[PDB]
Design a binder for this molecule. Structure first.
Ligand SMILES: CN(CCOc1ccc(C[C@H](Nc2ccccc2C(=O)c2ccccc2)C(=O)O)cc1)c1ccccn1
Lengths: 10, 267
């Protein structure tokens, strides 16, 4: 998944 | 770039914005030198049950009859917010968001838990750990009394914290130190190591100057702190094995998707 990248992109 | 003190102050300012409970505030609570009331102490099943509703927790529902599983579930809620806090802090490190997005993910994947255990030391004394933004205090003996393998999780974190707290770092020191950890050019799978090492060079220079100014009596503190990075890797390694005993011998205990992603293919 890409959950960590979701917290990054704000 | 040339001014190391400006970098230190920028990181400290971001540190204060990202982490609600700093070491300074935690020390004021643990030593009782604060205006607010003492934390609620959680030392057994009854005191946990009495302080449970002050623990932040949003889910479908009553979760379980077992104390170990109750703490396991609540500790993973905290871990999720810690990753979110560290991610927020990481985006303020100068140059971090200019890196490849895949490398930002990689640096976070391997860095967050080393940072989590570093900042836990700020919330620990030899007898327990602060929880719920300093509102409660859960004793070391209680965490160690949990049935296997739950009683084995926190004890190595307490052992690390006693030795780590002996260095007497403060929030200004820790802000640079955790940035150094995130900007590790030797994380597995990094695509562009050179620009990462360029950032860590300034962070390391700022850290060394910060420790010399803030601890002029602590000779070779820079070297001692870098050696603690090896203590943190053993904690991660031991923690992953403890999670695997849980995964093989305990039932329904699936980790939060964010934690599963971090631990998946880790080392
Ligand atoms: C003891 N404590 C503060 C500890 O803070 C952390 C302590 C450790 C961690 C890291 C985190 N660990 C877990 C993740 C999922 C489930 C359990 C754990 C435990 O670590 C654990 C297991 C058994 C018994 C006790 C803990 C991670 O790997 O992501 C993150 C935060 C709290 C806080 C809130 C609620 C309950 N208590």
């Amino acid at each position: 998944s890409t959950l960590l990248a979701s917290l990054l992109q704000s | 770039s040339a001014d190391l003190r400006a970098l230190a102050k920028h990181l400290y300012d971001s540190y204060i914005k990202s982490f609600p409970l700093t070491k300074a505030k935690a020390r004021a609570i643990l030593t009782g030198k604060t205006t607010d009331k003492s934390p609620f102490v959680i030392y057994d099943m009854n005191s946990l049950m009495m302080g449970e509703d002050k623990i932040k927790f949003k889910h479908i529902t009553e979760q379980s009859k077992e104390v170990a599983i109750r703490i396991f579930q609540g500790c993973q809620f905290r871990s999720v917010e810690a990753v979110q806090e560290i991610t927020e802090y990481a985006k303020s490190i100068p140059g971090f968001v200019n890196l490849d997005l895949n490398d930002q993910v990689t640096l976070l994947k391997y860095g967050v838990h080393e940072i989590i255990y570093t900042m836990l030391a700020s919330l620990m004394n030899k007898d327990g750990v602060l929880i719920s933004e300093g509102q409660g205090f859960m004793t070391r003996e209680f965490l160690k009394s949990l049935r296997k393998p739950f009683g084995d999780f926190m004890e190595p974190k307490f052992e690390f914290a006693v030795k780590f707290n002996a260095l007497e770092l403060d929030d200004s020191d820790l802000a640079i130190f955790i940035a150094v950890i995130i900007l590790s050019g030797d994380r597995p799978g990094l695509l562009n190591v050179k620009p990462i090492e360029d950032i860590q060079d300034n962070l390391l220079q700022a850290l060394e100057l910060q420790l010399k100014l803030n601890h002029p009596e602590s000779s070779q503190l820079f070297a001692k702190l870098l050696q603690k990075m090896t203590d943190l890797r053993q904690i991660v390694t031991e923690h992953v094995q403890l999670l695997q005993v849980i995964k093989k011998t305990e039932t329904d205990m699936s980790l939060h998707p964010l934690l599963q992603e971090i631990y998946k293919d880790l080392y």
